[PDB]
Ligand binder design. Structure first.
Ligand SMILES: *[C@@H]1O[C@H](CO)[C@@H](O[C@@H]2O[C@H](CO)[C@@H](O)[C@H](O)[C@H]2NC(C)=O)[C@H](O)[C@H]1NC(C)=O
Length: 40
């Protein structure tokens, strides 16, 4: 094993978490830099 299959779950958690947090953070950077209601 249950620990060896728990390393498998967090290995594929960490791949899609990094690419998808980057889009959530870059879109928030563009709003705080450039106030438009298009960017809300
Ligand atoms: C701030 O955000 C607006 C979007 O609301 C940007 O306006 C775009 O500007 C590009 C040119 O750089 C145009 O091709 C787009 O059509 C524009 N979009 C809209 C909805 O007008 C604006 O450029 C941003 N400011 C900066 C400095 O990047």
């Amino acid at each position: 094993t249950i620990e060896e299959q728990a390393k498998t779950f967090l290995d594929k958690f960490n791949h899609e978490a990094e690419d998808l947090f980057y889009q959530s953070s870059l879109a928030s950077w563009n709003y705080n830099t450039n106030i438009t209601e298009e960017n809300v």
